Amino acid sequence: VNSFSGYLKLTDNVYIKNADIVEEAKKVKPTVVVNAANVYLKHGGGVAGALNKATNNAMQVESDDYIATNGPLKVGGSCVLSGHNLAKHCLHVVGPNVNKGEDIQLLKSAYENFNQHEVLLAPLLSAGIFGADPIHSLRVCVDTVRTNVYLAVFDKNLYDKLVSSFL
Numbered sequence: 001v002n003s004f005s006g007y008l009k010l011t012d013n014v015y016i017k018n019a020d021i022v023e024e025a026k027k028v029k030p031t032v033v034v035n036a037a038n039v040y041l042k043h044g045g046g047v048a049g050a051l052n053k054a055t056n057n058a059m060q061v062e063s064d065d066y067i068a069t070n071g072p073l074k075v076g077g078s079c080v081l082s083g084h085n086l087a088k089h090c091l092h093v094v095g096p097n098v099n100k101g102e103d104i105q106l107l108k109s110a111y112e113n114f115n116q117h118e119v120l121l122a123p124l125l126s127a128g129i130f131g132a133d134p135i136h137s138l139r140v141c142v143d144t145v146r147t148n149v150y151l152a153v154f155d156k157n158l159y160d161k162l163v164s165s166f167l
Protein backbone atom coordinates (compact mmCIF):
# COMPACT_ATOMS: atom_id res chain seq x y z
CA VAL A 1 0.00 0.00 0.00
CA ASN A 2 1.21 3.50 -0.90
CA SER A 3 -0.09 7.06 -0.64
CA PHE A 4 -0.81 7.83 -4.31
CA SER A 5 -4.48 8.78 -4.63
CA GLY A 6 -6.96 9.14 -7.47
CA TYR A 7 -4.98 7.28 -10.14
CA LEU A 8 -6.54 5.20 -12.88
CA LYS A 9 -4.88 1.78 -13.14
CA LEU A 10 -3.70 1.02 -16.67
CA THR A 11 -1.77 -2.22 -16.08
CA ASP A 12 -0.37 -4.32 -13.25
CA ASN A 13 2.26 -1.64 -12.57
CA VAL A 14 1.30 1.62 -14.37
CA TYR A 15 -1.10 4.23 -12.99
CA ILE A 16 -2.13 7.61 -14.44
CA LYS A 17 -3.70 10.84 -13.17
CA ASN A 18 -4.52 14.32 -14.46
CA ALA A 19 -2.27 16.24 -12.08
CA ASP A 20 0.43 18.89 -11.82
CA ILE A 21 3.54 16.84 -10.99
CA VAL A 22 4.81 19.71 -8.81
CA GLU A 23 1.67 19.73 -6.66
CA GLU A 24 1.57 15.93 -6.62
CA ALA A 25 5.18 15.68 -5.41
CA LYS A 26 4.60 18.30 -2.70
CA LYS A 27 1.62 16.28 -1.42
CA VAL A 28 2.99 12.72 -1.60
CA LYS A 29 6.71 13.36 -0.97
CA PRO A 30 7.53 10.23 -3.00
CA THR A 31 10.81 8.39 -2.70
CA VAL A 32 11.53 9.25 -6.35
CA VAL A 33 10.21 12.02 -8.59
CA VAL A 34 11.32 11.86 -12.23
CA ASN A 35 12.46 15.02 -13.99
CA ALA A 36 12.18 15.48 -17.76
CA ALA A 37 15.83 16.52 -17.98
CA ASN A 38 18.16 17.50 -20.80
CA VAL A 39 21.80 16.41 -20.99
CA TYR A 40 23.03 19.69 -19.49
CA LEU A 41 20.56 19.59 -16.58
CA LYS A 42 19.46 23.10 -17.60
CA HIS A 43 16.00 23.19 -16.06
CA GLY A 44 14.51 26.03 -18.07
CA GLY A 45 10.97 25.06 -18.99
CA GLY A 46 8.47 22.29 -19.26
CA VAL A 47 8.39 19.88 -16.34
CA ALA A 48 12.03 20.62 -15.46
CA GLY A 49 11.48 24.36 -15.25
CA ALA A 50 8.44 23.81 -13.02
CA LEU A 51 10.20 21.34 -10.69
CA ASN A 52 13.23 23.59 -10.39
CA LYS A 53 11.10 26.67 -9.69
CA ALA A 54 9.36 24.75 -6.90
CA THR A 55 12.79 24.12 -5.29
CA ASN A 56 13.60 27.86 -5.34
CA ASN A 57 16.42 27.09 -7.87
CA ALA A 58 18.18 24.66 -5.49
CA MET A 59 17.75 21.90 -8.08
CA GLN A 60 19.62 24.04 -10.64
CA VAL A 61 22.43 24.88 -8.20
CA GLU A 62 22.93 21.19 -7.38
CA SER A 63 22.71 20.28 -11.08
CA ASP A 64 25.36 22.82 -12.12
CA ASP A 65 27.79 21.30 -9.63
CA TYR A 66 26.95 17.81 -10.92
CA ILE A 67 27.69 18.82 -14.53
CA ALA A 68 30.89 20.66 -13.57
CA THR A 69 32.15 17.42 -11.99
CA ASN A 70 30.76 14.76 -14.33
CA GLY A 71 29.97 16.36 -17.68
CA PRO A 72 26.70 15.99 -19.57
CA LEU A 73 24.39 13.02 -19.40
CA LYS A 74 23.66 10.83 -22.42
CA VAL A 75 20.35 11.01 -24.25
CA GLY A 76 18.55 8.00 -22.82
CA GLY A 77 20.53 8.26 -19.57
CA SER A 78 19.87 9.48 -16.06
CA CYS A 79 21.33 10.51 -12.74
CA VAL A 80 19.99 10.47 -9.19
CA LEU A 81 20.16 13.77 -7.32
CA SER A 82 18.34 15.27 -4.35
CA GLY A 83 14.58 15.61 -4.41
CA HIS A 84 14.87 18.82 -2.34
CA ASN A 85 11.46 19.78 -0.88
CA LEU A 86 9.59 17.63 -3.41
CA ALA A 87 10.77 14.03 -2.88
CA LYS A 88 13.60 12.08 -1.29
CA HIS A 89 15.36 11.75 -4.66
CA CYS A 90 14.99 13.19 -8.14
CA LEU A 91 15.76 10.84 -11.02
CA HIS A 92 16.77 13.16 -13.87
CA VAL A 93 15.99 11.21 -17.07
CA VAL A 94 16.87 12.44 -20.57
CA GLY A 95 14.33 11.40 -23.17
CA PRO A 96 15.08 12.25 -26.80
CA ASN A 97 14.01 15.75 -27.85
CA VAL A 98 12.32 15.50 -31.25
CA ASN A 99 12.77 19.24 -31.73
CA LYS A 100 16.54 18.49 -31.68
CA GLY A 101 16.41 15.58 -34.15
CA GLU A 102 17.14 12.89 -31.56
CA ASP A 103 16.36 9.23 -32.23
CA ILE A 104 12.93 8.32 -30.86
CA GLN A 105 14.16 4.75 -30.34
CA LEU A 106 16.12 6.23 -27.43
CA LEU A 107 12.81 6.62 -25.61
CA LYS A 108 12.86 2.96 -24.54
CA SER A 109 16.39 3.35 -23.14
CA ALA A 110 15.21 6.42 -21.21
CA TYR A 111 12.32 4.50 -19.62
CA GLU A 112 14.65 1.62 -18.66
CA ASN A 113 16.13 3.93 -16.01
CA PHE A 114 12.82 3.70 -14.14
CA ASN A 115 13.41 -0.03 -13.50
CA GLN A 116 16.16 0.82 -11.00
CA HIS A 117 13.50 2.21 -8.61
CA GLU A 118 10.66 0.25 -7.07
CA VAL A 119 8.15 3.15 -7.11
CA LEU A 120 8.25 6.48 -8.98
CA LEU A 121 6.17 9.57 -9.68
CA ALA A 122 6.88 10.59 -13.26
CA PRO A 123 5.83 12.60 -16.31
CA LEU A 124 5.57 11.04 -19.75
CA LEU A 125 9.10 11.16 -21.15
CA SER A 126 9.72 13.13 -24.35
CA ALA A 127 6.19 14.62 -24.18
CA GLY A 128 5.40 18.32 -23.97
CA ILE A 129 8.18 20.58 -25.24
CA PHE A 130 10.32 17.52 -26.07
CA GLY A 131 8.06 17.05 -29.10
CA ALA A 132 7.16 13.35 -29.05
CA ASP A 133 3.66 11.91 -29.33
CA PRO A 134 2.45 11.35 -25.73
CA ILE A 135 0.35 8.35 -26.82
CA HIS A 136 3.55 6.72 -28.05
CA SER A 137 5.39 7.68 -24.86
CA LEU A 138 2.70 6.00 -22.75
CA ARG A 139 2.92 2.85 -24.89
CA VAL A 140 6.70 2.68 -24.46
CA CYS A 141 6.32 3.29 -20.73
CA VAL A 142 3.86 0.42 -20.31
CA ASP A 143 5.98 -1.92 -22.44
CA THR A 144 9.31 -1.03 -20.75
CA VAL A 145 8.78 -0.11 -17.10
CA ARG A 146 8.25 -3.09 -14.78
CA THR A 147 8.41 -1.20 -11.48
CA ASN A 148 5.46 0.76 -10.09
CA VAL A 149 5.06 4.06 -11.95
CA TYR A 150 2.54 6.82 -11.18
CA LEU A 151 2.22 9.09 -14.20
CA ALA A 152 1.13 12.71 -13.76
CA VAL A 153 -0.32 14.36 -16.88
CA PHE A 154 -0.72 18.13 -16.56
CA ASP A 155 -3.15 18.70 -19.43
CA LYS A 156 -6.69 17.47 -18.78
CA ASN A 157 -7.51 17.23 -22.48
CA LEU A 158 -4.40 15.13 -23.09
CA TYR A 159 -5.12 12.93 -20.07
CA ASP A 160 -8.58 12.05 -21.39
CA LYS A 161 -7.15 11.24 -24.82
CA LEU A 162 -4.47 8.99 -23.29
CA VAL A 163 -7.02 7.05 -21.24
CA SER A 164 -9.62 6.79 -23.99
CA SER A 165 -7.07 5.58 -26.56
CA PHE A 166 -5.18 3.18 -24.29
CA LEU A 167 -4.99 -0.39 -25.54
Ligand SMILES: COC[C@H](O)C1(Nc2ncnc3[nH]c4cc(Br)ccc4c23)CC1
Residues within 6 Å of the ligand: 019, 020, 021, 022, 036, 046, 047, 050, 122, 123, 124, 125, 126, 127, 128, 129, 152, 153, 154, 155, 158
Ligand atom coordinates in the same frame (compact mmCIF):
# COMPACT_ATOMS: atom_id res chain seq x y z
C1 LIG B 1 1.24 18.25 -22.92
O1 LIG B 1 2.52 18.16 -22.33
C2 LIG B 1 2.46 18.17 -20.92
C3 LIG B 1 3.00 16.86 -20.38
O2 LIG B 1 2.04 16.30 -19.48
C4 LIG B 1 4.36 16.98 -19.68
N1 LIG B 1 4.45 17.95 -18.59
C5 LIG B 1 4.08 17.77 -17.30
N2 LIG B 1 3.76 16.53 -16.88
C6 LIG B 1 3.42 16.38 -15.59
N3 LIG B 1 3.35 17.30 -14.63
C7 LIG B 1 3.67 18.52 -15.07
N4 LIG B 1 3.67 19.64 -14.29
C8 LIG B 1 4.04 20.73 -15.07
C9 LIG B 1 4.14 22.06 -14.71
C10 LIG B 1 4.49 22.97 -15.69
BR1 LIG B 1 4.57 24.81 -15.24
C11 LIG B 1 4.75 22.58 -17.00
C12 LIG B 1 4.64 21.24 -17.35
C13 LIG B 1 4.28 20.29 -16.39
C14 LIG B 1 4.05 18.86 -16.40
C15 LIG B 1 5.59 16.80 -20.52
C16 LIG B 1 5.19 15.73 -19.54
Ligand SMILES: [Cl-]
Residues within 6 Å of the ligand: 045, 046, 047, 127, 128, 129, 130
Ligand atom coordinates in the same frame (compact mmCIF):
# COMPACT_ATOMS: atom_id res chain seq x y z
CL1 LIG C 1 6.30 20.22 -20.97
